[PDB]
């Protein structure tokens, strides 16, 4: 019962000689955050590192980098003893040698480019026989600390002369390489990688214990997503990091053979993974082998599908084999493969969000050298609809434009192998600014599931509606116990209705931002574009995406288009509304999926939507008042530089009966007047400066930097109301008599 045996978890820090610990474990273990610890591992191999602190780190777990993890012959979830050692002295001679595979391109220097900035103000604790890694110069490079004269371990001081001359040596056959793929090469998919580790790590770490329990493990894991999102990468990383045997079956490579060779290749893969248990068999591109029953023709294709089903069912009589697979959508797989005892667990890898895209861009720009203006958060906010492969291509294209301009400088003697041109080489912001425009993203039709970025501050007015939406959406998530006590059940749906342009889409986004839930937006034209024989699996697919990503807000915008397409034979409108109604009835509230609709025409809505148990909360969103107009105009003008002279309350008194869209239109029109005036002034000053050279005052400056009362008072003369007064009386009537539409009605 010792407090020094610890177990490895994933690393957050980026350094090669820093381990992390939580503070109570250090205080029990008598360690301070400047110490120099010694770490023992399997096959009697040990390491030396600098410890620091963390709060996200637990006590039963230590977080260390992959380079330390591979110098200890340790994988994820293994045992390591830690002990303090202030017995570390400085050095005199330290002999390093590169490793033969990483040094086949460059020749010339290795000391000043690589080793010189690495040990400067670092004092990295090294030991004899350790491999370390340096990034820089569009390449990563390995070295091994071969010999220390104060043997065996020391701290690299400026006293130590570092021998970097000799032959790059060969590897030992059990040295784990650093060009392999691990968990740090994957970004933007934290949750899914956690699920796959939970499913897979225990039945492959502990086969004997888990056989001795008597529980069944999973055996079929189907990864799916759009093309190019890193599924082959995830399977390869789980295989390398658990250390299991790994056999790869490729889809076209099996279907390209002749007949009896295809059957025997499948059978040999499953037998060979019997022999070397534990294993992982990865079937890449499954829908080339086993597509739909109606899309196969012949004897050979159906015979291969039946072969694969026999082997998947016969895995039960085997020991410790996981079968993974990958496909671009689940609906094209033969549905007999997704039963029980076959591919029964599904993991969905989607397109990344903004945090994900920044993390991809940081992965691919490791070995490159960036210029000092390049801010990758702006690139990550610009690139929308990019999967990971597109971001890798964008980084590669920017690097090639930089090397092309340096061949515009240096072309004559650049043909030799120089390290200096690589030293000077840098990628500016305009290269990324170029390659952003000449890039063709590939996931724009895909439905986006993310948290929105519209807070409550973008919305002005509407103060009781916000309270009502909190009490509908947020309260049965945070406080389920009150609803258990008082004996009621929460409701499921809301319908917003009202005049055009008053802020319904913004409210539906802001409550999803408030509750930190996902958000799926569907518009009426998107449902009507879905075809005659195609709308069915599509509406079911949207309600499935809502169940997988719960707690969710599923928002049906623009229902008046679906209503107007009925009656001019409008059969597709009736088919879509009936199928939405059936899916709402089937939905059980124990996943916290919450449904919202919105309409500008509350007179032609289908009354069966308003039934209790369906969208039966009716919130009327009206034209704003004078205080509300002041709040709207303040909300739209937060980014614009506005002069002090502007009176907003005067604009609110002058604009009566406007909606929110018209107030935004007035702001847009005034800003165009400002840009026109500025460009006239720049043409006039350029003309005058060029027509009178040698001017005594070279004073470049903003002539008008802000928006004054002239611009708003001119933009006010072109204002037009969007909602006429007869319409205002009709919306006031429906505000009270909408709920009576279900009987005979009107």
Ligand X SMILES: Nc1ncnc2c1ncn2[C@@H]1O[C@H](COP(=O)(O)OP(=O)(O)OP(O)(O)=S)[C@@H](O)[C@H]1O
Residue pair 135/369 in contact by the 8 Å Cβ criterion: no
Q: Which stretch binds ligand X (CB under 6 A): 39-47, 65-73, 459-467, 730-738?
A: 459-467
Query: Is residue 364 marked as binding?
Result: yes
Count of helix runs (H) and strand runs (E) in the chain: 28, 23
Least spacing, CB of residue 115 vs its own copies, in Å: 31
Query: Counting contacts by CB under 6 A, is residue 48 touching ligand X?
Result: no
Q: Which stretch binds Mg ion (CB under 5 A): 103-111, 166-174, 346-354, 497-505?
A: 497-505
290: left (phi over 0), alpha (psi -120 to 50) or beta: beta
Provide φ and ψ at 454, rounded to 5°.
-110, 110
DSSP SS3 for 223: strand
Least spacing, CB of residue 564 vs its own copies, in Å: 9
Least spacing, CB of residue 130 vs its own copies, in Å: 26
Which partner in ligand X, Mg ion, its own copies, none is near 250 (CB below 5 to 8 A by kind)?
its own copies
Query: Counting contacts by CB under 8 A, is residue 437 touching its own copies?
Result: yes
Q: Which stretch binds ligand X (CB under 6 A): 225-233, 311-319, 371-379, 478-486?
A: 225-233
Least spacing, CB of residue 382 vs ligand X, in Å: 18
Query: Counting contacts by CB under 8 A, is residue 744 touching its own copies?
Result: yes
Q: How far apart are CA 170 and CA 172, in angstroms?
A: 7
Query: Is residue 328 marked as binding?
Result: yes
Query: Counting contacts by CB under 5 A, is residue 232 touching Mg ion?
Result: yes
DSSP SS3 for 225: coil
Q: Indicate the burial class of 451 (C-beta count within 10 angstroms; 0-12, 13-18, 19 or more).
A: middle
Hey, what are 484's tokens? 């258990």
Name residues contacting ligand X, limited to 687-706 (CB under 6 A). Answer: none
Residue pair 97/162 in contact by the 8 Å Cβ criterion: no
Query: Counting contacts by CB under 6 A, is residue 286 touching ligand X?
Result: no
Query: Counting contacts by CB under 6 A, is residue 518 touching ligand X?
Result: no
Which partner in Mg ion, ligand X, its own copies, none is near 319 (CB below 5 to 8 A by kind)?
none
**Closest residue by Cα to residue 563 from 610, 614, 525:** 525
Which residues does 219 contact at the CB level (< 8 Å), separation at least 6?
315, 321, 322, 323, 341, 344
DSSP SS3 for 124: coil
Q: How far apart are CA 167 and CA 591, in angstroms?
A: 63
Hey, what are 643's tokens? 């002069």
CB nearer to its own copies: pick between 141 and 670: 670
Which of 259, 371, 661, 695 is the binder for ligand X (CB under 6 A)? 661
Q: How far apart are CA 613 and CA 179, in angstroms?
A: 56
Binding mask 250-269 for its own copies (x = CB under 8 A): x-xx-xx-x-----------
Instruction: List C-alpha distances in Å: 593 to 11, 200, 638.
Output: 35, 29, 34
30: left (phi over 0), alpha (psi -120 to 50) or beta: left
Provide φ and ψ at 40, rounded to 5°.
-105, 145
Name residues contacting its own copies, limited to 468-507 (CB under 8 A). Answer: 471, 475, 479, 482-483, 485-488, 491, 499-501
Query: Counting contacts by CB under 8 A, is residue 697 touching its own copies?
Result: no
Query: Is residue 743 marked as binding?
Result: no
CB nearer to ligand X: pick between 144 and 364: 364
Binding mask 629-648 for ligand X (x = CB under 6 A): ---x--xx------------
State the DSSP code for 493: E
Name residues contacting ligand X, limited to 187-206 (CB under 6 A). Answer: 187-189
Q: Which stretch binds its own copies (CB under 8 A): 40-48, 348-356, 595-603, 620-628?
A: 595-603
Query: Counting contacts by CB under 8 A, is residue 323 touching its own copies?
Result: no
- Looking only at Cα atoms, what is the longest distance across the chain? 98
Which of 192, 428, 505, 678 is the binder for Mg ion (CB under 5 A)? 505
Give CA 103 to chain center in angstroms: 34
Hey, what are 594's tokens? 């919450």
Applying CB under 5 A, the residues found at the interface with Mg ion are: 232, 505
Q: Which residues are annotated as a binding site for ATP?
A: 227-233, 328, 364, 501-506
Applying CB under 6 A, the residues found at the interface with ligand X are: 186-189, 227-233, 328, 339-340, 360, 363, 388-389, 392, 459-461, 500-506, 611-612, 632, 635-636, 660-661, 664
């Amino acid at each position: 019962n010792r407090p020094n045996r610890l177990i490895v978890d994933e690393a957050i820090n980026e350094d090669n000689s820093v381990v992390s610990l939580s503070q109570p474990k250090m205080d029990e273990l008598q360690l301070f955050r400047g110490d120099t610890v010694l770490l023992k591992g399997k096959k009697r191999r040990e390491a030396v590192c600098i410890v620091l602190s963390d709060d996200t780190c637990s006590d039963e777990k230590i977080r260390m980098n992959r380079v330390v993890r591979n110098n200890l012959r340790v994988r994820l979830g293994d045992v390591i003893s830690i002990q303090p050692c202030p017995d570390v002295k400085y050095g005199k001679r330290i002999h390093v040698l590169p490793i033969d595979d990483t040094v086949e391109g460059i020749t010339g220097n290795l000391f000043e480019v690589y080793l010189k900035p690495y040990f400067l103000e670092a004092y990295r604790p090294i030991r004899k026989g350790d491999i370390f890694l340096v990034r820089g110069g569009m390449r990563a490079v390995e070295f091994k600390v071969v010999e220390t004269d104060p043997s065996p371990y020391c701290i690299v001081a400026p006293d130590t002369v570092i021998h970097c001359e000799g032959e790059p040596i060969k590897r030992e056959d059990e040295e784990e390489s650093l060009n392999e793929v691990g968990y740090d090469d994957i970004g933007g998919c934290r949750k899914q990688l956690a699920q796959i580790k939970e499913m897979v790590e225990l039945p492959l770490r502990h086969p004997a214990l888990f056989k001795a329990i008597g529980v069944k493990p999973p055996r079929g894991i189907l990864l799916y997503g759009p093309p190019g999102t890193g599924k082959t990468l995830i399977a390869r990383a789980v295989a390398n990091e658990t250390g299991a045997f790994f056999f790869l079956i490729n889809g076209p490579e099996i279907m390209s053979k002749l007949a009896g060779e295809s059957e025997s290749n499948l059978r040999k893969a499953f037998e060979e993974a019997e022999k070397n248990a534990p294993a992982i068999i990865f079937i890449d591109e499954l829908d080339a082998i086993a597509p739909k029953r109606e899309k196969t023709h012949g004897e050979v294709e159906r015979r291969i599908v039946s072969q694969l089903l026999t082997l998947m069912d016969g895995l039960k009589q085997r020991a410790h084999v996981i079968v993974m697979a990958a496909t671009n959508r689940p609906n094209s797989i033969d549905p007999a493969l997704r039963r029980f005892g076959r591919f029964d667990r599904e993991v969905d890898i989607g397109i990344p969000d903004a945090t994900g895209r920044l993390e991809i861009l940081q992965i691919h720009t490791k070995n490159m050298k960036l210029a000092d203006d390049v801010d990758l958060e702006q690139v990550a906010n610009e690139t929308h609809g990019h999967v990971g492969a597109d971001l890798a291509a964008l980084c590669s294209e920017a690097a090639l434009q930089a090397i092309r301009k340096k061949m515009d400088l240096i072309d004559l003697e650049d043909e030799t192998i120089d390290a200096e041109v690589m030293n000077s080489l840098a990628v500016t912001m305009d290269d990324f600014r170029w390659a952003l425009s000449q890039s063709n993203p590939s996931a724009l039709r895909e439905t986006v599931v993310e948290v929105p970025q519209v807070t409550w501050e973008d919305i002005g007015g509407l103060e009781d509606v916000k309270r009502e939406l909190q009490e509908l959406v947020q309260y049965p998530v945070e406080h389920p116990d009150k609803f258990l006590k008082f004996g009621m059940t929460p409701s499921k749906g809301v319908l917003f209705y009202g005049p055009p342009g008053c802020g319904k889409t913004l409210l539906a986004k802001a409550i999803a931002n408030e509750c930190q839930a996902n958000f799926i937006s569907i518009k009426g034209p998107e449902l009507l574009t879905m075809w005659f024989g195609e709308s069915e699996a599509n509406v079911r697919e949207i309600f499935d995406k809502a169940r997988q990503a719960a707690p969710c807000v599923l928002f049906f915008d623009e229902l008046d288009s679906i209503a107007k397409a009925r009656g001019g034979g409008g059969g597709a409108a009736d088919r879509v509304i009936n199928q939405i109604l059936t899916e709402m009835d089937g939905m059980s509230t124990k996943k916290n999926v919450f449904i919202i609709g919105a309409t500008n025409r509350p007179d032609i809505i289908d009354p069966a939507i308003l039934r209790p148990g369906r969208l039966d909360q009716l919130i009327y969103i009206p034209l704003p008042d004078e205080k509300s107009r002041v709040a709207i105009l303040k909300a739209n003008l937060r980014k614009s530089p506005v002069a002090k002279d502007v009176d907003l309350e005067f604009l609110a008194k002058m604009t009566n009966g406007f909606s929110g869209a018209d107030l935004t239109e007035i702001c847009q029109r005034a800003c165009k007047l400002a840009i026109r005036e500025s460009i006239e002034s720049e043409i006039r000053r350029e003309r005058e400066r060029q027509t009178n050279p040698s001017a005594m005052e070279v004073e470049e400056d903003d002539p008008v930097p802000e928006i004054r009362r002239d611009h708003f008072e001119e933009a006010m003369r072109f204002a037009r109301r969007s909602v006429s007064d007869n319409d205002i009386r009709k919306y006031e009537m429906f505000a009270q008599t909408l709920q009576q539409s279900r009987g005979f009605g009107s």
